[PDB]
Amino acid sequence: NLVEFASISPEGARVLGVIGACRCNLVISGGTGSGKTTLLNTMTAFIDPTERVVTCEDAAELQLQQPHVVRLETRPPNLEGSGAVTMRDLVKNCLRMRPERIIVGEVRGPEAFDLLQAMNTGHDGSMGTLHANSPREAISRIESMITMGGYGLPSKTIKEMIVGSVDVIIQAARLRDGSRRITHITEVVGLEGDVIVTQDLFVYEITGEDEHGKVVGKHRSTGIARPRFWDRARYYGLERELAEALDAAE
Amino acid sequence: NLVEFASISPEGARVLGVIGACRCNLVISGGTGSGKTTLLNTMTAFIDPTERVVTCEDAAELQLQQPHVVRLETRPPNLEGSGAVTMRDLVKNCLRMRPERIIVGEVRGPEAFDLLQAMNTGHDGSMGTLHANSPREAISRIESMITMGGYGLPSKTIKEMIVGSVDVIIQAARLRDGSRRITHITEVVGLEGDVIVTQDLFVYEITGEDEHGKVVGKHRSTGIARPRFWDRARYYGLERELAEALDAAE
Amino acid sequence: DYYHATKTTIFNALLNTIDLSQLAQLDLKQAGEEIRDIVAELVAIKNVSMSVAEQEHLVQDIINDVLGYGPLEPLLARDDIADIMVNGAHRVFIEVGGKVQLTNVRFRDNLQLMNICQRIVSQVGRRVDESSPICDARLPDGSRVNVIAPPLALDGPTLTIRKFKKDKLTMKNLVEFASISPEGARVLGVIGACRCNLVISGGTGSGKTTLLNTMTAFIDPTERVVTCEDAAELQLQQPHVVRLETRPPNLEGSGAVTMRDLVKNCLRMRPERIIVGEVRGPEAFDLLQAMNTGHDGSMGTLHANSPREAISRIESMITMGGYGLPSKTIKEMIVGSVDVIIQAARLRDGSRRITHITEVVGLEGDVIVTQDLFVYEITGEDEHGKVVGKHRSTGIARPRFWDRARYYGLERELAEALDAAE
Amino acid sequence: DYYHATKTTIFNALLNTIDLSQLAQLDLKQAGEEIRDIVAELVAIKNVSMSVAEQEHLVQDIINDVLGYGPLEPLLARDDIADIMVNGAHRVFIEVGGKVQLTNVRFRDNLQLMNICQRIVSQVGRRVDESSPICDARLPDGSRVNVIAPPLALDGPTLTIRKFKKDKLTMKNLVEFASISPEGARVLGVIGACRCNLVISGGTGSGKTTLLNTMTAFIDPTERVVTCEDAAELQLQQPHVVRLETRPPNLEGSGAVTMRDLVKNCLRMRPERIIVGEVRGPEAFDLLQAMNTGHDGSMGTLHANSPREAISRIESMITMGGYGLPSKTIKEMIVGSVDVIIQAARLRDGSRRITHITEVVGLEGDVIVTQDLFVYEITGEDEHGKVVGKHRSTGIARPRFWDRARYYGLERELAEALDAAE
């Protein structure tokens, strides 16, 4: 449907399939009502059925189709202020339930830190969705969430933790006409000094407007033939498909 | 068994035995599911029986056969957020329990610092598994973990501590075909300006893949005749075995 | 077997006969006498044949298992034993002659072992249990007791008792190990007795904490010393030492008592020397103020590979303090406070040396000028790879602290040591 | 031994006989009478034979332990004892004639010592426990008490009582003690008289309060001065002085009257000068607002080791004082409000001096620029170990506050003093 709705070009869909299948630590950022949860639900479709996936949510939105999926939901504090089970606790437990992927329904608090730890300590493929209007803003938001998450860490410590953990950022966005698109598919290339350097594998360029007022644009590949996660693709034999997709939409 | 599975060549097995029996400070890095814990359990088989070993683990997995072994386990906080005994606390105490070696199940937080301290303060032979895909990444992860501890240590100080503490890093990786391999046995030679210099004694080189799809490779000695830890081997009388094994692998 | 069965039966009868609460309300001697009488009565009732000496030994064993420390009592009594390591109720090792040996001493079970551990720690008011499983205490006799509870120790409660070895941390060890030549040792003794402000900087693995212990060995007994440590490891032989320890923030990041807070409070306790275990942050500033406020003689370790690097690190921490102090002000503060810097380093061959004994002469405009009283000159290595070097005195006949030595009457010793070192 | 054993038995019987909470509910006299009656009854029941004096001593000791300050009572009563240092339950030192001596006094255990410490700190509304291990306070009788709890104090609760000194110094004494040159004294008189917003900074025991009292000695009698303090250290000789003291929160956490509230009210009592005993919190802001809005001459003691550090501390205090303001806003508020900073400090020999008399010249960019009118230069050391130095004027003949001096006709004396000493 997303390919039909022009939300992402067919080559973009193929690249997303490769990213999801090859166990890439994903962050699906986006603005409010921009399709974050729908995009995450579609991305989960690429996980192997064998993998033990653990999904944490606040409202039980996702509808993963795999057989080995554990659905967890946070419990808000009662009126007395007790019994709270924050997403951080769910993720901390998930570290002890022997999962392959941890899927957080939405990162908005300290759990970010834990989630990133999960991404960086063997739970490759963990996906989360975040509220941010651009990948740069997504990275800054993640850094802030880690910062306020109790533990006092250097800013550079958090930045390099983010660089090591997150592999790809997908920017779901809503356009001026109310339509929805996948504006950015971006790689967290590394850290230079104190600035996180990222490269956009796919970008949506708006080229005008139609007679009915609907925005007009197109998805184009930046031409990066060897994305940072290429190795992961090789690990799963998907490097051929990644190269084909990156070349077919230059 | 690891020799049988071609994970490490027989000369590599001899070198690992020398490293273990020499009380060399150790860090066993590795990727996801790469056998870090299994490799650590194998290496602990070389510890002298008379040594007082102390084991810290989030989840009891190691099974040391020595008589004088003390096994400790962290206690995660209850849902009330009380009673937490972090691995940092366990290592802090272990520094007081008069051990010969401290075996940390997996270094994933500030405990790194304490572990490194144990290596400086006469508990030669301390081991610890770590999640990282290369010795350089292992060292960077150790630096980050030390920074997480809240001490105001500069980067240069942490690098100096790592160089003075860690002696050998063993990188075990899981390859595409599901094979486990000890990719690197590399010393921490020293610290040039801002950069830790390591030399690989033992390296696993992939020459390609067979028609069956299995990765084909071999373990090769870099030819370094006098490892930095050669003096310790001479002290324990194993230096001749070390030289013989290194020459044979060459 | 007969002795063991008789002891078990007698202990069971005594436990079923006397309530532990009543004994707890009675002193050790009264409770022991009552227990001996009750054990004699129980033996008579059970009609157990035993000699007078055997009966007395059984009574003493029962008292130890009830009031004393059970099987540990003989081991603690022995003096050759240096350390005792109980790993669960069935494994007990003892460090004799510098080597650890397994022993046939065993406890009845983990319950008796845990009771004995709790008694030992409570002897100094500490408590160990599942709520607080880890306990570390220093008994009044100097022995150090560490206890780990079953919830953390898989194989049962673990107990480590390290009896006090007085002679291990002494300047004699440094002199014999060549860490410092005898003249250097004499000059260090003068510096310690002169109440000079010391900063014992050292690289990683240089063992500067052992050096700090050795230096504190020179403190006059009458002085009121206060030691701040992140994790208490110093062991001062003086009788007026106050030991403090920083409290790390809990998992919520609250309740921390940083070293800076400890030193700030130490300023208000009328101490004569302040011994900071290691300076890593803004506490440097406070420590330096203590060195300048009148508590001359304060010490403190530091991570640095040379005295100049130590001074740079101190400046960096003071700047990290957050006060709007210009670099020149911090340099002047350092020059005013610090008197002597001792650089100890672990050489290439893993051996520890006191590479430098240097003095902060003053501040020339913007550069802190320091003069080295003693240096280590490396001239080669052995065929074994061991490093070869000698401790040489720079020849400075009048170090800046010479006045302090003259005031304390140690000028003659200082001059003799400096001349002999050459 | 008989007396001690009998006392222990009587205390145990009393504990098993009555609940200390009920006695605490009663007044001191009634509780003491009941305790004496119960002790006599227990002695009769216990058939304890002792003299009338021995019985009275035992009753007094029991009463002191139950509600008094335990073994400290004889030491506190003694006048020659200047300081008492309890390093855990079993070590008590007393400073007599300037020399620290060990005493046979001992506490039953660290729990009794902790209870005594909690009583002493609560006597002034302060609470010390595991959550708040460190507690410093000043008792009404002028003594100052410092307490550290077992979590930090490894060897047990640490208590330090520094008893009050019956006398206070005057500017003539300070000139006599060389704390400030006569020209410095004249300049200080001009500064105080001419209503200069003043800040007295210094370290612990620097003499900030004594210097503040001497400065207040210069205020005109006609001026309505309002002094806010804790424990009421100051003793102003002026006739129109209003003495206010903060009220710490009760154990329920209610009724607190912070110094900020006192200053806010002082703004509404029509004062000329507001004198804050010591700025330690948000009141700083308010105080500065008072200085910059018509209450010229307001003074305040601050804890800082240099004028730069004093300015930084004031800025931080304003910052954390609830209101969120730009750093430059706070900086220019400080520049406008504060006119002079006086730095009382201790030297390495323990002597006290007025190291800096400094003017807050202005704000350049984001850096507060100040000029030192008077500075103490240390030029060496004497044969007795006492620091040697001298106060010198920077030569600034027209200090920023010159106008104020002109306003009160004091400009001529200001020039004379600034010229005479250089």
Ligand SMILES: Nc1ncnc2c1ncn2[C@@H]1O[C@H](COP(=O)(O)OP(=O)(O)OP(=O)(O)O)[C@@H](O)[C@H]1O
């Ligand atoms: N690419 C798309 N094309 C068309 N319609 C879409 C697209 N993505 C989402 N929608 C529609 O918009 C709705 C937006 O809800 P969705 O849960 O996807 O948003 P979200 O990013 O999670 O927002 P929120 O901030 O509310 O959590 C979806 O339920 C679906 O109805």
Ligand SMILES: Nc1ncnc2c1ncn2[C@@H]1O[C@H](COP(=O)(O)OP(=O)(O)OP(=O)(O)O)[C@@H](O)[C@H]1O
């Ligand atoms: N110039 C001086 N010469 C000699 N003794 C002095 C001098 N100034 C103060 N003192 C004495 O030294 C002690 C300092 O106490 P004071 O209350 O003045 O200090 P402070 O700066 O307020 O300290 P604190 O941090 O305790 O509040 C008192 O005994 C005071 O009498």
Ligand SMILES: Nc1ncnc2c1ncn2[C@@H]1O[C@H](COP(=O)(O)OP(=O)(O)O)[C@@H](O)[C@H]1O
């Ligand atoms: N060198 C090896 N060769 C074959 N199998 C291995 C090897 N190392 C580990 N394994 C297998 O991998 C499994 C999990 O490895 P594990 O000890 O969890 O490594 P890690 O702790 O790094 O994930 C074990 O059950 C073990 O059988």
Ligand SMILES: [Mg+2]
């Ligand atoms: Mg959503």
Ligand SMILES: [Mg+2]
């Ligand atoms: Mg493992």
Ligand SMILES: [Mg+2]
């Ligand atoms: Mg005061």
